[PDB]
Every structure is written in structure tokens, then in C-alpha cells.
Amino acid sequence: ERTWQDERIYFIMVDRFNNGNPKNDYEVDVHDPKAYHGGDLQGIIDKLDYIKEMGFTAIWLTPIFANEKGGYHGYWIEDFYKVEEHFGTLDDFKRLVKEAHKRDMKVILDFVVNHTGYNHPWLNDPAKKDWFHEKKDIFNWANQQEVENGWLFGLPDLAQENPEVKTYLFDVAKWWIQETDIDGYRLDTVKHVPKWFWDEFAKEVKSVKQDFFLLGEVWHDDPRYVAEYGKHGIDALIDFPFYKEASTIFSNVDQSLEPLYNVWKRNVAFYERPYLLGTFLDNHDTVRFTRLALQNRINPVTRLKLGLTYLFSAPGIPIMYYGTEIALDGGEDPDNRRLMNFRTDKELIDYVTKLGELRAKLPSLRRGDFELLYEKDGMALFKRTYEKETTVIAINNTSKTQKVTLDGELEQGKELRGLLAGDLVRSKDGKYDIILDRETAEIYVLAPKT
Numbered sequence: 001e002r003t004w005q006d007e008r009i010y011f012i013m014v015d016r017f018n019n020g021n022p023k024n025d026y027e028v029d030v031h032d033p034k035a036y037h038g039g040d041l042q043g044i045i046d047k048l049d050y051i052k053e054m055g056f057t058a059i060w061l062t063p064i065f066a067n068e069k070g071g072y073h074g075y076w077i078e079d080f081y082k083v084e085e086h087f088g089t090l091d092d093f094k095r096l097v098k099e100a101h102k103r104d105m106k107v108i109l110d111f112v113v114n115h116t117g118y119n120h121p122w123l124n125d126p127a128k129k130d131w132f133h134e135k136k137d138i139f140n141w142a143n144q145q146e147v148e149n150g151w152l153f154g155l156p157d158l159a160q161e162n163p164e165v166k167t168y169l170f171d172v173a174k175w176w177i178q179e180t181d182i183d184g185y186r187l188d189t190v191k192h193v194p195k196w197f198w199d200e201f202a203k204e205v206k207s208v209k210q211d212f213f214l215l216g217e218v219w220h221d222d223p224r225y226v227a228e229y230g231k232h233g234i235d236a237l238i239d240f241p242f243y244k245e246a247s248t249i250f251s252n253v254d255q256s257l258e259p260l261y262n263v264w265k266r267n268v269a270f271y272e273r274p275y276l277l278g279t280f281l282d283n284h285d286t287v288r289f290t291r292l293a294l295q296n297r298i299n300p301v302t303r304l305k306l307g308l309t310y311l312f313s314a315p316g317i318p319i320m321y322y323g324t325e326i327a328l329d330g331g332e333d334p335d336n337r338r339l340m341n342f343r344t345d346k347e348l349i350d351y352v353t354k355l356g357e358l359r360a361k362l363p364s365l366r367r368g369d370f371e372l373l374y375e376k377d378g379m380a381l382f383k384r385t386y387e388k389e390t391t392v393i394a395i396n397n398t399s400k401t402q403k404v405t406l407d408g409e410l411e412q413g414k415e416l417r418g419l420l421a422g423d424l425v426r427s428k429d430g431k432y433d434i435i436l437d438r439e440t441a442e443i444y445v446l447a448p449k450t
């Protein structure tokens with residue numbers, strides 16, 4: 001049966017994906033990095049087959065609720081019960097969900113509880129003074145209550161301690177679920193909101209949809225800090241510790257993969273559900289992984305193939321930011337949120353398709369254990385086993401041809417059939433000699449000798 005461990009997520013910033021209706025292009029200006037660029041819900045529906053053909057099983061949309069001026073990204077909300085006018089209507093969104101569901105795809109909406117836009121009407125309502133915390137900047141970030149009570153980036157910080165605010169938020173959470181039949185929320189700014197709140201929130205949204213999925217963004221690289229939030233009703237967490245290592249290691253050649261395995265081991269140590277961690281090479285808040293490769297003066301296509309190979313073969317829930325599949329460039333926010341281009345070379349689109357198909361086909365890649373057999377200076381072998389399937393993931397992140405011999409770590413008398421690139425390694429006297437040319441990868445299934 002399908003579980004969230006089995007899912008692959010395609011992550012989209014609505015305004016920056018596909019402008020499928022030019023008639024809602026209000027003040028659009030593609031040459032202003034802080035304007036709306038036109039991407040909308042019709043654009044998303046038009047590309048669902050594109051997304052599915054890459055092997056993606058779910059989509060995550062940045063927030064669709066009406067924003068104030070300047071809020072192209074969706075995080076400066078003006079009305080919690082309205083679809084943003086640039087993106088479409090409520091009916092256009094219900095059709096998106098129906099069309100995703102027709103293709104067996106899940107829909108995750110980005111959901112904000114922490115704050116409103118700078119100019120939300122509530123700020124003028126004398127009866128709403130107590131809906132917001134005192135207007136203060138966050139200074140001591142080691143003070144968790146200051147982090148929870150301060151105005152993040154000057155954004156009006158909602159007071160969940162007020163039961164009217166809490167009820168409003170639960171009410172709206174439940175409404176979108178009941179009205180549009182979405183499958184989950186990606187929860188923004190989870191660490192700026194107190195833990196007791198998430199326990200109650202979780203209980204509310206699953207009371208209306210038993211299997212409703214929550215993915216928490218807890219922006220921190222310490223897994224002990226992040227994992228505490230999984231005890232408060234949030235199913236899955238964004239893996240910033242994975243990201244930190246994967247972005248760095250795969251953006252240049254001749255770098256050790258071992259820190260990624262320690263990320264795993266630490267995930268098993270600290271989290272209740274270590275397969276339910278969202279893994280990624282970049283996102284809408286980081287520099288593009290392509291930019292990291294460019295900065296290192298090295299071919300980004302090659303870097304992405306190795307990184308994506310790891311992403312689609314390691315534990316977790318892969319989350320691929322729109323544009324990864326065309327090596328879309330971009331520096332810091334807002335330059336990491338460039339309009340998508342659908343008319344490029346297809347090399348990475350096809351590669352990603354292969355990887356998504358292999359992750360779907362090979363249950364060891366979704367549910368297997370995860371063992372490190374060998375790692376030296378970027379040359380890595382991993383093993384995964386699920387029931388009677390054994391897979392070996394070989395990533396040569398070195399600038400040399402590498403030969404590694406396994407002798408004991410695999411059952412003798414068999415062969416490793418390469419499913420990514422067609423390699424074949426037969427057991428010779430109980431040994432498997434694995435050869436990979438520089439900056440290549442292969443995913444092998446252990447099978448009878450042919």
C-alpha cells in the first residue's frame with residue numbers, strides 16, 4: 001500500500017512556474033524580480049502530465065491565499081479564505097486538485113500560521129489588537145520564546161495564545177481541507193510557533209481527514225532541535241541537515257559522500273520516523289544548486305546527475321524544486337525564483353525520469369535499510385535491502401576511474417545488473433569488481449548470474 005515514504009514531491013512556486021492564463025497578469029513584470037511574473041493555477045494544471053511523466057507522485061505549491069501587493073511568493077497573506085487573484089479562482093484550484101487526483105498525484109499546500117502580510121486589515125481593527133504579539137525584532141535566537149514571539153522579518157506575528165486567533169487558524173485549516181480535498185500541508189515557519197499549538201493543530205486537521213499529511217519546515221541544521229517537532233503531531237520534517245551536506249558535496253567533484261551517511265545515522269538516532277524527512281539539493285530560500293556548481297567553475301549538468309542520483313536512491317522523501325531538471329540558475333532570493341523554461345535540452349528531464357522510475361520500481365529505494373559499504377574521497381558504494389531485493393548504489397564523485405572490489409558484503413555467485421546505465425558485474429570467486437569512470441553513477445540490483 002502507498003505510504004508517504006514512497007512519495008516523490010515536485011515543488012512549485014506558483015507565480016514562477018507556468019503562466020497558463022494571461023488574463024490574470026495584473027501588473028506583471030518579468031524584468032522586476034520583486035513583481036508578479038504571471039505563473040498561475042492553470043499553468044500548473046497544464047503541466048501535470050509533464051510532472052507525472054518525471055515520476056513525481058505529489059506536488060507542493062507555495063501558498064495560494066490572497067496576498068497584498070508585492071507578495072508574489074504567497075507568504076504575505078491578506079485574506080485566508082480567498083485564492084490570490086493573480087493565480088486563479090477557487091474553482092480553478094478545485095479543478096487542479098481533481099486533475100492531480102485523476103493522475104494519482106497528491107496535492108500539498110503551503111500553509112502559514114505564524115504571520116500575516118505587512119498590511120493585513122486586521123492591523124487596523126481596534127478589536128484585533130490582541131491578535132498580534134508586540135511588535136519586536138528577534139535578537140537572541142537562542143531564546144526560543146523570543147523566536148516564537150518576535151516579528152520575523154517585520155511580519156505581524158500572530159498570537160496563538162489568544163483562543164480567538166487559535167480558533168480562526170484551526171477553522172481556516174479545516175476549511176481548505178473540507179472544501180478542496182487536498183492531501184496535506186507543508187507548514188511554514190514551524191519553529192516560530194509554539195509546540196503546544198502544533199499538537200492541537202495536528203489533532204484538528206486529522207479530525208477532518210484521517211490520513212492528512214503534515215510536512216514541517218523547521219529551519220535549523222541540528223537534527224536534535226528539528227526532531228522534537230515530530231513529537232508534536234507533525235509527520236514529516238524538512239531535512240536541512242541533508243540539504244546542507246548534499247548541496248555542498250555534489251556541487252564539486254572529489255568530495256567525500258560520508259557526511260551524508262552520518263546524516264542518516266543521526267536521523268535514525270534522533271527521529272521517530274526517519275524515513276519521513278524531506279530531502280533536497282536546493283529550495284526557494286537557498287541559492288540554486290546550479291549556481292553552486294557555476295561558482296566552482298564546473299559543469300552543473302554533471303553535478304546534478306550525481307546529486308539527483310543520491311536524492312532518488314537515499315532514504316527520505318525526495319523534494320525537487322521546479323527547474324532543477326533544466327539546471328536553472330539563480331543566486332539568493334529573489335534570483336532563485338526565476339520563471340521556468342519548458343523548451344530546453346532534455347538530458348536532465350530524462351535522467352530524473354529514470355531515477356523516479358527506479359525509485360518507484362525498487363522497494364529497497366523506498367523502504368530498504370541503508371548501509372555504507374565503501375567510501376573514499378567521493379567514491380561511494382551503498383547497499384539497501386528490502387525483503388528479497390538487494391540494491392547497490394555506486395556514485396563516483398571523483399575525477400578518476402575507480403575500481404572497488406566487494407568480497408563478503410554481497411551474496412556470492414550472483415550478478416549486479418545496472419539499471420541506470422546498463423552496467424553488469426558478475427561474481428568472480430565471491431568478488432564483485434565495480435568499475436566506474438569519473439563522475440558517473442549506477443544503481444544495481446542483485447540478481448541470478450546470466
Ligand SMILES: OC[C@H]1O[C@H](O[C@H]2[C@H](O)[C@@H](O)[C@@H](O)O[C@@H]2CO)[C@H](O)[C@@H](O)[C@@H]1O
Pocket residue numbers: 073075112153188189217219284285333
Ligand atoms: O518578507 C520576508 C520574507 O518572507 C517570505 O519568506 C518565507 C520563506 O520563503 C519560507 O519558506 C519560510 O522560511 O517563511 C518565510 C516567511 O513566511 C518570502 O519568501 C521572502 O522572499 C521574504 O524575504
Ligand SMILES: [Ca+2]
Pocket residue numbers: 019020021022023024025038039040086
Ligand atoms: Ca497568469
Ligand SMILES: [Ca+2]
Pocket residue numbers: 066067068069084085086
Ligand atoms: Ca493580491
Ligand SMILES: [Ca+2]
Pocket residue numbers: 114147148149150157158192193
Ligand atoms: Ca510567532
Ligand SMILES: [Ca+2]
Pocket residue numbers: 374375376377
Ligand atoms: Ca572511507
